[PDB]
From a paper:
The re-acylation is catalyzed by lysophosphatidylcholine acyltransferase (LPCAT) and among the four LPCAT members in human, the [name] preferentially introduces polyunsaturated acyl onto the sn-2 position of lysophosphatidylcholine, thereby modulating the membrane fluidity and membrane protein functions therein. Combining the x-ray crystallography and the cryo-electron microscopy, we determined the structures of [name] in apo-, acyl donor-bound, and acyl receptor-bound states. A reaction chamber was revealed in the [name] structure where the lysophosphatidylcholine and arachidonoyl-CoA were positioned in two tunnels connected near to the catalytic center. The structural and functional analysis provides the basis for the re-acylation of lysophosphatidylcholine and the substrate preference during the reactions.
After solubilization with LMNG, the oligomeric [name] was further separated from its monomers by size-exclusion chromatography in glyco-diosgenin (GDN) supplemented with 0.2 mM arachidonoyl CoA. The 3D refinement using C2 symmetry generated an EM density map with an overall resolution of 3.49 Å and a resolution of about 3 Å at the core region of cLPCAT3 protomers. The cytoplasmic end of the vertical tunnel is lined with positively charged amino acids and thereby provides a docking surface for the coenzyme A moiety, where the binding of CoA is stabilized by the electrostatic interactions among the pyrophosphate section of CoA and basic residues R409, as well as K365, 368, and 373. The araCoA extends into the T-shape chamber and turns at the joint point near H388 to a “side pocket” with its double-bonds in the acyl chain, and the carbonyl oxygen of the arachidonoyl pointing to the conserved residue N352, implying its role as protonation reagent in the hydrolysis of thioester bond. When N352 was mutated, the cLPCAT3 show an impaired acyltransferase activity, confirming its critical role in the reaction. To hold the acyl chain, the side pocket is in general lined with hydrophobic residues, e.g., F344, I348, I404, M446, and L450, and the functional assay showed that the mutations on those sites could reduce the enzymatic activities to various degrees. Unexpectedly, the E401A mutation fully abolished the acyltransferase activity, implying the importance of E401 in maintaining the binding of the acyl-CoA molecule. The cryo-EM map analysis on cLPCAT3/araCoA revealed the non-protein electron density sandwiched by cLPCAT3 protomers and two 1,2-dioleoyl-sn-glycero-3-phosphocholine (DOPC) molecules were well modeled into the large blobs of electron density. This non-contact dimerization might be mediated by those intermediary lipid molecules and the relatively harsh detergents used in the crystallization trial deprived the cLPCAT3 of the lipids bound, resulting in the monomeric biological unit in cLPCAT3 crystals.
Residue numbers in the entry:
A (entry chain A), B (entry chain B): 42 to 490
The structure:
């Protein structure tokens, strides 16, 4: 039992998480094979039982926390449903519950535990509360992309339990809305585009690609190391070696996430929740619940071309439920700073997340300024119009996006001020000084030309 | 020097604070004797010099913190003066500066230091920012008590420095607005009600009363003790003795504040800032800058009769700049809870202030419910109309307000969860259980009759 559990250099918790994630396929197959049920309560109870069983298997003494959390949530949502006080009360309650969880947890390296499922659950649930409050407004246009996306005040006595504890998107899965779940519940998501289809092209391809990334990461894992950053053995002697190591790093840690999300996607594609219609050619498209892009993620030089292709669901949720809801402050920068601060507090332990997200804001602002300036000058346009040879558009432009990505990703994997600063000072604070110089130089030359 | 500094059981810091507070009278006399100055910059420079000298005398390495704080404040107020972003930015900046100060300070017992002057300064300065933002609105009625109280957008290049560093109300003094300070600056506060008047009846009486309370407190100080609560020597054996001790306590700690505020009042009465007009009889009244009431403070049985007579200035400021500015949430209880939470965060170290203010909210709600129910019943009105003898209105009603006052004041002087809980459990959590029972009983009997 335990002899082979930790045999291949794996802890007791990572293997448990990976087997729990992989165990979603048989449940989806069982549900799809038995679809002749015409009563929704059976599906709801099945989802609740499967979610609770998975939570028990992962850790058997902490699921009652999330159970009482969702219980209190719909208990308080039943009363004062449309009141503006309700949304603020549920926001404060959920945020303080998560913050107390982090404060009393005090994890050190990763320590896979209840925190991730509770975090996903609470963000999805705050989204549900916002949607319910908005759905009680007047039926007019109101940014017409909302009526298809907002609940119509229907009773939610039991659907909230099954919606919260979905077996597919429980650990790190997507964060779909409420209306699509209700459409799935009583069997009208696909009349005949996807009853039998597909389970052949999309799901198998996604599973195979996830397995490919997983084997690549586990083959490249022992060769590289993370604690070598702290260690001083033949590291502080050369300079360019440190930059090259950080460049090679950062592009390898991210894969740790990638595989995971991809395999979760497969489960959804098997259920049918990913359907959103068909294109002009008439072929149905399933790229609606996707969390990553196949190709654009790793073949984009622009800084802003990654935040739109790394994780679609969380970024889209933040854009939808912060920017569109905080337009009464007359400054876009303040709204962006508030959104990034909220995203930092979402999973921020001590200091690494704050500095990482501040740095990210700095890159996005600098990139927007630079891209605005180019192709907007009487003289620089001709220089940029040189298209016979493009050395700048070549590898010269790249191998700098990855370097700053690793530079801003270092505080993410080391969130203690001592280790953070000790490993971050040896690179001479290159990114901050370089971007401060650039940010103070561009306005003057822009005014010059 | 130091032989007599600590001779009478006094630390090096309390004596410094008391001598600094008392040293305000000679400066006021010097200013009043030389009033023929027709230029405001001389008065402003005099106020700044006196305030900086007092700050240097109290502690000589930390005043630059407040100097840079006020500098940054009016630097950021110069730009985007009327923008809604400015008020939120200054609010966040001041609050986070004070919170960082408390977090990096980590005081234990009282440890008189920079924190109190910085706290008073930052609250006054946030008030100034709110006033400046409001003054840029339309000139209509707008709760007509505001035009006399709001600035009219006049330049504030130098008046902010003299206003912030007033020598009178610097440590624990009052928190007067901006317009009255400007009226005082160029000499039109009193044309001839108070050029020579008075400095005889008001100031001397206030000083004498403050000295009387001070000598009473210092005579009753060594007889009683505070650490006896922690000590178990012949304390945990009897029960009624603990309640009697807490009753006698609480009424003695408050005097520690009282004297202080009173003596500060004297300084203001000498300057002339306390004038607000005259009554119907024509005699001028100086009870405008007062921070305590002479008689109503200690001769009121009602719970709500103390929050309107303990400290007028801070309570009035909180009522003016929170309730009147947070009416867009449709629930009074939420506004009250937010105000009390802000007042707790104002000077809250770890836990005692939060529980103290929550308890205070509970008493005020319970008292309002009880006073609403009485004299509002078909049958209980006759019982309450018995006026031949009033044992209830006698000492029976009192000796219970003081007891709950001490019960809710215990966590204020012991703000560490260990000592707090250890001294608070021995009284069997009497207040919380009694008021929970009363709060759950009154609605049913109210519906009954
Ligand atoms: C290379 C760049 C980044 C490099 C990475 C650096 C650090 C990396 C940090 C973490 C990476 C490491 C591990 C990540 C993996 C797992 C950890 C979880 C963390 C994440 O996985 S997270 C990754 C980044 N995480 C973000 O979070 C960044 C993006 N997050 C945003 O939020 C963005 O900002 C975005 C792109 C969504 C918005 O970008 P945008 O600015 O282009 O949006 P846009 O302007 O196009 O929209 C126009 C609409 O603004 C509204 N509008 C106008 N004026 C307004 C005003 N005055 N006030 C308010 N609203 C206003 C109008 O209503 C209009 O609406 P309409 O369309 O109808 O006109
Ligand atoms: C015995 C009771 C307390 C016992 C003490 C227990 C614990 C003691 C705690 C500390 C004591 C120890 C040491 C203290 C010494 C130094 C430490 C510093 C701490 C202090 O030194 S601190 C002491 C207490 N510290 C407080 O802080 C309590 C009071 N602090 C408040 O804030 C109160 O609450 C108050 C009385 C000021 C307000 O009392 P209130 O409720 O009677 O006011 P009211 O109703 O009369 O005003 C009607 C107006 O509400 C507005 N309005 C209506 N509906 C609304 C809605 N839906 N939303 C928003 N606004 C609405 C309308 O606009 C209307 O305006 P209009 O007049 O035009 O009609
Ligand atoms: C614009 C912001 C300016 C930043 C403000 C700077 C605050 C730091 C200032 C003064 C602290 C002096 C402390 C007095 C003593 C307290 C000790 C303490 O407790 O402190 C510890 C350290 C000092 O070491 P030690 O004396 O104990 O050495 C002892 C030897 N040994 C190394 C073996 C441990 O103090 C430190 O250095 C603290 C190092 C950093 C800690 C906080 C992280 C800063 C966060 C930056 C991100 C802000 C972005 C916000 C906006 C986000 C938008 C998305
Ligand atoms: C409605 C609110 C419900 C309250 C939530 C309760 C949270 C407490 C819960 C669970 C904590 C279990 C902890 C697991 C271990 C972590 C240790 C820790 O770090 O914790 C320490 C203590 C436990 O002692 P130990 O194991 O270390 O003993 C060791 C032996 N020895 C005594 C020598 C030190 O944990 C404690 O007991 C904590 C005691 C209290 C600390 C926070 C104070 C509560 C605040 C209440 C006011 C809320 C009002 C808000 C609204 C304001 C409106 C104006």
């Amino acid at each position: 039992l335990a002899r082979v559990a930790e045999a291949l250099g794996s802890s007791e918790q990572a293997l448990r998480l990976i087997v729990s994630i992989l165990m979603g396929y048989p449940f989806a197959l069982f549900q799809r094979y038995f679809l002749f049920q015409k009563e929704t309560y059976l599906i709801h109870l099945y989802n609740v039982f499967t979610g609770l069983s998975i939570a028990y298997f992962n850790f058997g003494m902490q699921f009652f926390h999330s159970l009482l959390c969702v219980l209190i949530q719909f208990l308080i949502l039943r009363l004062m449903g449309r009141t503006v006080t309700a949304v603020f009360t549920t926001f404060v309650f959920q945020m303080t519950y998560l913050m107390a969880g982090y404060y009393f947890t005090a994890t050190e390296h990763y320590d896979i535990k209840w925190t991730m499922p509770h975090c996903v659950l609470t963000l999805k649930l705050i989204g549900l509360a916002i949607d319910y409050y908005d759905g009680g407004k007047d039926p007019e246009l109101l940014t017409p992309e909302q009526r298809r996306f907002a609940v119509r005040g229907v009773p939610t006595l039991l659907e909230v339990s099954g919606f919260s504890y979905f077996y597919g998107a429980f650990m790190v899965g997507p964060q779909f809305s409420m209306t699509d779940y209700q459409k799935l519940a009583k069997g009208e998501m696909t009349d005949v585009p996807g009853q039998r289809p597909n389970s052949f092209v999309p799901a198998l391809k996604r599973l195979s690609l996830g397995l490919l990334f997983l084997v690549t990461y586990t083959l490249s894992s022992p060769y590289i190391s993370e604690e070598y950053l702290i260690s001083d053995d033949y590291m502080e002697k050369p300079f360019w070696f440190r930059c090259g190591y950080i460049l090679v790093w950062g592009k390898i840690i991210l894969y740790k996430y990638v595989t995971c999300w991809l395999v979760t996607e497969g489960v959804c594609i098997l259920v049918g929740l990913g359907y959103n219609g068909n294109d002009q050619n008439g072929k149905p498209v399933w790229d609606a619940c996707a969390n990553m892009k196949v190709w654009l993620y790793e073949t984009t030089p622009l800084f802003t071309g990654t935040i739109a292709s790394f994780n679609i669901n969380t970024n889209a949720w933040v854009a939808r439920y912060v920017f569109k809801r905080l337009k009464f402050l007359g400054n876009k920068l303040l709204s962006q700073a508030l959104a990034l601060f909220f995203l930092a507090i979402w999973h921020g332990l001590h200091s690494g997340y704050l500095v990482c997200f501040q740095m990210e804001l700095l890159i996005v602002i600098v990139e927007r300024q630079v891209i605005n300036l180019v192709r907007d000058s009487p003289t620089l346009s001709t220089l940029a119009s040189i298209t016979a040879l493009q050395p700048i558009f070549y590898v010269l432009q790249q191998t700098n996006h990855w370097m700053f990505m690793g530079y801003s990703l270092v505080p993410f994997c080391l969130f203690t001020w001592d280790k953070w600063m000790k490993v971050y000072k040896s690179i001479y604070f290159l990114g901050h000084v370089l971007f401060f110089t650039l940010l103070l130089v561009l306005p003057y030359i822009r005014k010059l030309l």
